[PDB]
């Protein structure tokens, strides 16, 4: 366990390192492609079908 | 519009016009019952009216009903434009119990008496198109420029 992974046992324990992230989002990248529906919702909608 | 040319009635047998073309014979009318009465084509004649422009007043008797960006970048008001589809789907709703009955009802009347009975207060499918239009036109727009609100500034 030792040299397959890492777990050194140092001071009376196996020690955990930091396995976590920050998520981040913008919600706005998607306010170019959301209006690239929008835009294909009333084309549809107004063509002589 | 209207215009008029007199003739003389000494001229009432001999010819008036040589009739070298179809342009004023034929053309815009044949001259109204109402007009004939006491004109044409006696005493007088008619005459053909256009429209020249030249292009400086052309182009700008185009432009004239549109706005700023000012006007293309509102976004109307969301308590209002929310109250409005609170409003027009709570009817909506009435117009769909309505909408149930008559399509179901279809009494085999040869449809033209159904044609007849429908004069008065009767409208299923006719209010049903209208608010779904109103209902579509309102909140795309107001979707749309204010996606572009986000994407344009900042």
Redesign the interface.
């Known amino acids: 366990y030792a040299k397959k992974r890492g777990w050194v046992l140092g001071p009376n324990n196996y020690y955990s390192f930091a396995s976590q992230q920050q998520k981040p989002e913008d919600t ?1 990248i998607p ?2 492609e ?2 690239k529906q ?2 294909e ?2 084309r549809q ?1 107004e063509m002589i079908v | 519009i209207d215009a008029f040319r007199l003739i003389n009635a000494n001229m009432m047998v001999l010819g008036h016009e040589p009739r070298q073309t179809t342009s004023n014979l034929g053309h815009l009318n044949k001259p109204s019952i109402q007009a004939l009465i006491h004109g044409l084509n006696r005493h007088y004649y008619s005459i053909t009216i256009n429209y020249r422009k030249n292009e400086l007043e052309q182009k700008m008797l185009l432009n004239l009903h549109k706005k700023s960006w000012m006007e293309g970048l509102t976004l109307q008001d969301y308590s209002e434009h929310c109250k409005h589809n609170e409003s027009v789907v709570k009817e909506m709703l009435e117009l769909a119990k309505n909408y149930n009955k008559a399509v179901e009802e279809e009494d085999k009347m040869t449809p033209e008496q159904l044609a007849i009975k429908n004069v008065g207060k009767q409208d299923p499918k006719r209010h049903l198109e209208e608010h779904v239009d109103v209902l579509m036109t309102s909140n795309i727009v107001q979707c749309l420029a204010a996606m572009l609100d986000t994407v344009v500034f900042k």
């Open positions: 706005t306010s170019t959301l209006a929008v835009i919702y009333a909608l």
